[PDB]
A paper describes a structure:
The E. coli AcrAB-TolC drug efflux pump contains the inner membrane H+/drug antiporter AcrB comprising three functionally interdependent protomers, cycling consecutively through the loose (L), tight (T) and open (O) state during cooperative catalysis. AcrB is the homotrimeric IM proton-motive force-driven H+/drug antiporter component which recognizes and actively transports multiple drugs (antibiotics, detergents, dyes, and solvents) via the tightly connected AcrA and TolC channels across the OM, leading to an observable resistance phenotype. Four different entry channels (CH1–CH4) have been described with putative entrances from the periplasm or the outer leaflet of the IM toward the two drug-binding pockets, the access pocket (AP) and deep binding pocket (DBP) inside the AcrB pump. Here, we present 13 X-ray structures of AcrB in intermediate states of the transport cycle.
In an attempt to prevent ansamycin binding, we made the switch loop more rigid by Gly619 and/or Gly621 to Pro substitutions. Surprisingly, the crystal structure of these variants showed propensity to bind either 3-FOR to both L protomer AP and the smaller AP in the T protomer in the same AcrB trimer or two rifabutin (RFB) molecules to the AP of the T protomer. We assume that the Gly619Pro and Gly621Pro substitutions induce a switch loop conformation mimicking a transition state during wild-type L to T conformer conversion while the HMW drug is bound to the AP. During the L to T transition, the HMW drug accommodates in the AP/DBP region, mediated by the flexible switch loop of the T protomer, in an induced fit manner. The intermediate positions of the ansamycins observed in these structures appears to precede the binding to the DBP as has been shown for erythromycin in the MtrD homolog RND pump from Neisseria gonorrhoeae.
Residue numbers in the entry:
A (entry chain A): 1 to 1034
B (entry chain C): 146 to 241
C (entry chain B): 50 to 145
D (entry chain B): 674 to 913
């Protein structure tokens, strides 16, 4: 194949171009992400029971729905929450690989059996089934710069003109309105209602009757009479459109003939469906859309489509209304990937310079510099075929690949330039001879190297999909690299390499190059003279090698391990959690303090703050709040102290002062669904119908016991709310029966007044919206206001609530949790410093075993994936070692000689561990995959040295020591050519600061440190390994 | 130990075992060989006839007196600003 | 039955349209509401979209919008079918 | 497919202006389009015009004063005049619908409205004429919506010797001079022609580049391929 393309350079060029077109066309069409989607699919059922307490919701909705959730494929677990706001949220989590489309269809197929058993009020609020991520992709804030519109006016506009179109955009799994759409608010007055002897029941009946859309048929409608000439639609009652129209709804005509209108017994205004969520952007009033990414959907592509839909709306905004972007997770992905693309382009340039230093011919320098772009672009085409995406790991696979790509090129170019220098053949014949003697080793090496990376594509579950990206990328690159090294690189050598005279090693060149050539030829002569002496010792360096393996073993064992570094993403969140029973006003006091801190203290770092009252992870009215903090560009805030980790740790420390409120600023982890580094997610189960009060006691007992082990467990706390005072009112059925008052009228009057009642729909400026009846605030604030509410008996007399009701204060849950259909209580916590999660969970199980009768436990979220198959690194690298040995045994046709290559592994590991240890890095994904790359090159170096030596001993019949010296003499220039080119190519990564520098620093440090030790040691030790091994086995 | 009848076993299976098994991996349809407990009101027509009542009166009463009412909140949104108390109103719960 | 364009639009078309969220690969959506007492909402999807998945996601979002439609419309039923103007043939049945 | 020159335009109410103001905005666009016969042909709405409809107002006060329930009134009207699907029945083993409606001769003209009586609480039969007033108004017998918002579909095509892309560009220009809140969008063939027309250049290019490169490999020269590639017009001329 080399011989063919040496005679056909234009053919070789055509293949390279087609590969680059395929690669180029792939880059335009390939999806872009931060990581591959490893998170398990989650379908969330959300229903709303207006005016319902936590238990009413649980025992009429949650349980009824949960009991129908059965025969659902690939279901891991099912958590549910039933809170005092009237909300239920059942999350069904599915196995990794589950089709989210089918999971939704199945979950919804079962919910459809439960729907008819649910209350009519819960049905009419719409039960939603959604397949989205639990955290926000972005937040689209909307403000008024002219201050022409209030917080409510903006919220209604966003809901009525923007919300729906965004919800229908592909990849948008869920959209949360930070505010409420307007409804027709009928604020009932009990003084006026009783005065005219009317109830909330009469108001609801009147609205339904007089806010009706009546289908009245047609004049001359079919079937018609003969000779009918007129056909016209009959328009009867239509929906009311204004506060005024609702105002003049006739409730009753008094005996004297005077009219009682709805406005005579109620304040009628346009106002939110609910008054629970109130948002502020940089202190001023705002609304917006919390957009959640659909399961398996592309963040960047979806974010783009969202922005495209917002661009359509902007032209038709009212005066002053303006979109702001106070939280976006996509820009980091778009910018952090561009930073890795930049270090790729920089490495290709930094290669060209080191390539020009040695070849010293602009045309010869391009042969390795052309090969790299062709393979990398080629790899993008292979990714596309295999259905992978342009993510951080694939993009870093390309960066680490560059090392393996130039070596293939350098080996081919260097060996041709040598052949010409030793014999004085023309470029075409020198290439033909050169390709003839290394093409076998190149193809063979790629199979030996593939046995290093292929194994880490066979890791299990979520953590395995991460490694499989690097593996397939690097392996695809090597496959193309060898293919390009047999098609193109030979053809380019034959045409572009300058004819070199016999005995011309430069030296005769004038200037810098002249000095360099003489300095290198004496360095080569010194090196060969130096190695000559090393081999006469042998025993000295075998004792020195055993020291390095012990030093390696020591550093590796003490060096801590992680998964993926926490990156500054130019965004973070602050959670505000007050004790349940705390008011909207008290939460806003804390949110103001949080917003104040970021706008005053962190004005240098923080760009914007989007604070939301009555929202957190989900809507949790009154006692809960969240702040979305977007920072300034990474360039505008240099140093560790101005990065998210420092900012949030200062913020948490500052917010610890705040009273009767838990306030935490936290960075979003590398992957949310893997949780913290050493945290656990524990579930306490009621297995014997003990009840909530007994389960609360069982939890308190466990938490108390967990506190008595600070040595093992750190900050073990519940992920729920505590019981609060609740107003228990008993309706005396006998007294109600005696006075002639129906319980329907009683319950409707209480619920409609204090809870609110969704009557029917109306048309607000051409859009269908809700009509809500409810007590005016001032008549539903005090317990004593209960007696102000009158119900009409059958005999016509108005009866106060005080007449047929008794009340008392009691305690109950504002948020009832269930796990796998049983009453539960989520408990979070991490292992104490030094102790592992496995040791911590073991103690939690032990402590949980001592709990009262009927109390079980379980592990969920991150803890579920931990007790699942893990720690399979010894297994897969035991195989890798065995396969690498066998592959070398086939190459050299020897069971013994492979050891001469396999003993160089530690020479590269020691450098990685030293550099990683000294810079305070950890044994993470980026360190491991960068170490495999270093082991790959140092092994590839060792293969060619032993190959040349063995070839001399077999083909030329030269002696062991003479062959070793002659081998290392020819295999020095190409080794140092690769080391410099790769060490200098990953300099940008090591010094890197800005977006995604955490990964770059981690990749670059482990590689640079390794390559340094892997080069200087190998050139002296590979000879010692070959001579020791060949002597030992004869 | 003969402390549970066919009915008692069937309820425990239906109420504590069936649902968790029906959600286990690879499990399709789950048929209960028995019945879960319901609240059984066994009506006597002679006693109903005596007090001039029907199954209609019994149903109407059970729906009225075995109700789970959504009764709203004290100090709920929108509140009168300065409100300190925010408490759920618990009306009728299900009979147990 | 007996509904004007406005009545259909403001009780059926708008309610259904408002609930057509979280459906994958939707390009655009169009609807008619006329005095023949009929509404027809057409959802056109991206080329290569599984029409079965497209249809099931639409009828599922409709199922949860059904309780918000009038009794008269719920009773009649709301059909969700794959759009097609291409017949193999039209068999005419006549009485001579 | 429709027509290749034909476009499919959607005039959109983006600010809750109403049906009537969207009708006026459409009439304005239809008029301006007619003032460019050189570019646009048969610019016409794919919709129905407003028609006379019989607006009847039930007086709530007279109904409540006469003891006539509004429910019985709106049922009597809807059931008689519009028809009402009551429940099902089995005809020869097939479940079929039961419909109550007025016999044609009692639901033809406005004069028939007063012949329909509703029973009051006191059992007296009150005619519709007693508690109702009627007038003529205009309304839509077919209300269109596009992407959730009120719309009006406009059909048309590029005039003789003009491209479909040119006609669209003018329709967009004329649309940018319509009342505040009146937006527009492309649908059907127009939506697809915009997307499928965007990628046409890239394919034509990729085709020529790969053909060239393939001939270059065959002949081992960058020059000779042109000798082959120059043939393209010799076939196209005769076809045309
Ligand atoms: C480790 O996890 C963290 C971040 C996940 O990242 C997110 C994006 O993913 C989350 C998931 C999957 C949840 O389940 C959450 C949750 O249940 C919360 C809160 C909100 O606090 C949350 O905020 C989340 C939450 C996230 O932000 N609890 C509630 O809403 C309710 C009803 C009550 C609150 C109880 C206390 C106050 C809470 O337990 C507190 C003691 C801490 O333990 C948490 C705030 C944790 O903060 C940290 C840094 O210790 C987060 C769960
Ligand atoms: C190129 O297209 C043609 C035929 C397709 O062949 C068929 C088989 O396929 C059709 C399709 C895909 C439609 O969308 C139709 C349509 O929307 C219609 C009418 C019914 O006319 C139709 O009849 C069709 C129709 C066909 O018969 N409009 C309506 O019903 C409504 C609600 C209002 C009508 C408004 C006017 C009156 C109409 O716009 C008129 C001005 C012309 O524009 C059309 C009649 C076009 O004729 C011509 C001559 O240019 C057809 C769209
Ligand atoms: C020699 C070094 C080789 C290494 C090259 C590495 C480059 C990798 C870049 C990946 C990140 C950017 O990937 C980004 O993807 C989007 C996806 O639509 C592309 O978007 C593209 O959309 C359409 C597709 O027909 C094109 O007409 C348009 O010109 C282009 O913008 C961007 O042009 C590209 O910038
Ligand atoms: C299905 C599982 C299979 C997995 C096995 C694959 C891994 C094996 C890797 C070995 C790589 C091949 O290594 C191969 O070794 C032989 C000597 O033994 C070399 O040399 C031999 O073949 C060349 C081919 O032109 C000839 O000159 C001559 O027959 C001999 O010298 C090859 O040039 C080299 O390419
Ligand atoms: C630097 C950290 C520790 C890691 C060490 C690995 C890197 C090695 C760096 C290069 C060392 C080369 O050092 C080399 O040592 C050998 C002996 O061992 C010397 O050789 C000398 O001793 C030998 C042994 O008796 C004699 O046969 C020889 O005639 C004499 O010159 C070489 O003259 C010297 O060049
Ligand atoms: C890094 C540069 C160190 C000295 C370089 C010497 C350059 C001089 C060129 C050769 N000379 C003029 C001495 O013959
Ligand atoms: C990017 C295209 C590179 C073209 C290089 C051409 C050199 C080979 C031609 C040989 C002429 C005899
Ligand atoms: C060389 C590429 C092989 C592809 C690897 C797929 C294996 C998936 C691992 C799942 C195990 C739980």
């Amino acid at each position: 194949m080399p011989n063919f393309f040496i005679d056909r350079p234009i053919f070789a060029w055509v293949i390279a171009i087609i590969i680059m077109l395929a690669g180029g066309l792939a880059i335009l069409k390939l999806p872009v992400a931060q990581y591959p989607t490893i998170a398990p699919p989650a379908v969330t059922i959300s229903a709303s029971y207006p005016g319902a307490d936590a238990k009413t919701v649980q025992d009429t909705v949650t349980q009824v729905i949960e009991q129908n959730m059965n025969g659902i494929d690939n279901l891991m677990y099912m958590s549910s929450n039933s809170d005092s706001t009237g909300t239920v949220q059942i999350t069904l989590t599915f196995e990794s690989g589950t089709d989210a489309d089918i999971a939704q269809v199945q979950v919804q197929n079962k919910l459809q059996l439960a729907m008819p058993l649910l209350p009519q009020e819960v049905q009419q609020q719409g039960v939603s089934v959604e397949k989205s991520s639990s955290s926000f992709l972005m937040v689209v804030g909307v403000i008024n710069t002219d201050g022409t519109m209030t917080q409510e006016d903006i919220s209604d506009y966003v809901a009525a003109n923007m919300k729906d179109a965004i919800s229908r955009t592909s990849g948008v799994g869920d959209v949360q309105l930070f505010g409420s759409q307007y409804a027709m608010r009928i604020w009932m007055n009990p003084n006026e209602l009783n005065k005219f002897q009317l109830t909330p029941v009469d108001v609801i009946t009147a609205i339904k009757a007089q806010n009706a859309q009546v289908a009245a048929g047609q004049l001359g409608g079919t079937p018609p009479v003969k000779g009918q000439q007129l056909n016209a639609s009959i328009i009867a009652q239509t929906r009311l459109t204004s506060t005024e129209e609702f105002g003049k709804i006739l409730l009753k005509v008094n005996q004297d003939g005077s009219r009682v209108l709805l406005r005579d017994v109620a304040k009628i205004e346009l106002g939110g469906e609910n008054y629970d969520i109130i948002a502020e952007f940089n202190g001023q009033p705002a609304s917006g859309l919390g957009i959640k990414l659909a399961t398996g959907a592309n963040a960047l592509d979806t974010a783009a489509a969202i922005r495209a839909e917002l661009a359509k709306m902007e032209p038709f905004f009212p005066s002053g209304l303006k979109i702001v972007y106070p939280y976006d997770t996509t820009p980091f992905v778009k910018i952090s990937i561009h930073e890795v693309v930049k270090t790729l382009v920089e490495a290709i340039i930094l290669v060209f310079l080191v390539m020009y230093l040695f070849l010293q011919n602009f045309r010869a320098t391009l042969i390795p510099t052309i090969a790299v772009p062709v393979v990398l672009l080629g790899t993008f085409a292979v990714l596309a075929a295999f259905g992978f995406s342009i993510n951080t790991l694939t993009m870093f696979g390309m960066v680490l690949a560059i090392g393996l790509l130039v070596d293939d090129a350098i080996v081919v170019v260097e060996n041709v330039e040598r052949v010409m220098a030793e014999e004085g053949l023309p470029p075409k014949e020198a290439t033909r001879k050169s390709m003839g003697q290394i093409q076998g080793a190149l193809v063979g090496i790629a199979m030996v190297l593939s046995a290093v990376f292929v194994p880490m594509a066979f890791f299990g579950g979520s953590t395995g999909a991460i490694y499989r990206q690097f593996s397939i990328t690097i392996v695809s690159a090597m496959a193309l690299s060898v293919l390009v090294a047999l098609i193109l690189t030979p053809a380019l050598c034959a045409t572009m390499l300058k004819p070199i005279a016999k005995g011309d090693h430069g030296e005769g060149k004038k200037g810098f190059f002249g000095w360099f050539n003489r300095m290198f030829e004496k360095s080569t002569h010194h090196y060969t003279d130096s190695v000559g002496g090393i081999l006469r010792s042998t025993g000295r360096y075998l004792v020195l090698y055993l020291i390095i393996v012990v030093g390696m073993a020591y550093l590796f064992v003490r060096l801590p391990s992680s998964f993926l570094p926490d990156e500054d993403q130019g965004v973070f969140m602050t959670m505000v959690q007050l004790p349940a029973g705390a008011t909207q006003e008290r939460t806003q006091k804390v949110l103001n303090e949080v917003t104040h801190y970021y706008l005053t203290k962190e004005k240098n770092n923080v760009e914007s703050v989007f604070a939301v009252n009555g929202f957190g992870f989900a809507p949790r009215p009154q006692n809960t709040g969240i702040a979305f903090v977007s920072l300034k560009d990474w360039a505008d805030r240099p140093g560790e102290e101005n990065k998210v980790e420092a900012i949030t740790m200062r913020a948490t420390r500052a917010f610890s002062q705040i009273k009767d409120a838990m306030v935490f600023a936290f960075n979003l982890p590398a992957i949310v669904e893997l949780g913290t580094a050493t945290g656990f997610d524990f579930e306490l189960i009621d297995q014997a119908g003990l009840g909530h009060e007994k389960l609360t006691q069982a939890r308190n007992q466990l938490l108390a016991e967990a506190a008595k082990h600070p040595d093992m467990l750190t900050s073990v706390r519940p992920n729920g709310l505590e019981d609060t005072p609740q107003f228990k009112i008993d309706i005396d059925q006998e007294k109600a029966q005696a006075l002639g008052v129906s319980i329907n009228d009683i319950n409707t009057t209480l619920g409609a007044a204090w809870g609110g009642s969704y009557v029917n729909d109306f048309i607000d400026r051409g859009r269908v919206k809700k009509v809500y009846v409810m007590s005016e605030a001032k008549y539903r604030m005090l317990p004593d206001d209960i007696g102000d509410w009158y119900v009409r008996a059958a005999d016509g007399q108005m009866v106060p609530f005080s007449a047929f009701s008794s009340s008392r204060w009691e305690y109950g849950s504002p948020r009832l949790e269930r796990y796998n259909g049983l009453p539960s209580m989520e408990i979070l916590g991490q292992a104490a410093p030094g102790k592992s999660t496995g040791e911590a969970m073991e103690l939690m199980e032990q402590l949980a075993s001592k709990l009262p009768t009927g109390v079980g436990y379980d592990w969920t979220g991150m803890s579920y994936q931990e007790r699942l198959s893990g720690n399979q690194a010894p297994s897969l690298y035991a195989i890798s070692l065995i396969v690498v040995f066998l592959c070398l045994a086939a190459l050299y046709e020897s069971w013994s000689i492979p050891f001469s290559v396999m003993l160089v592994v530690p020479l590269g590991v020691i450098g990685a561990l030293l550099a990683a240890t000294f810079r305070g890095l950890t044994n993470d994904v980026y360190f491991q995959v960068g170490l495999l790359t270093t082991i790959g090159l140092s092994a590839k170096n060792a293969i060619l040295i032993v190959e040349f030596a063995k070839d001399l001993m077999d083909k030329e019949g030269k002696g062991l020591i003479e062959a070793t010296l002659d081998a290392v003499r020819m295999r020095l220039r190409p080794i140092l050519m690769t080391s410099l080119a790769f060490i200098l190519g990953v300099m940008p990564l090591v010094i890197s600061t800005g977006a995604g520098s955490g990964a770059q620093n981690a990749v670059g440090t482990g590689v640079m440190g390794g390559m340094v030790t892997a080069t200087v040691l190998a050139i002296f030790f590979v000879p010692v390994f070959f001579v020791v091994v060949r002597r030992r086995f004869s």
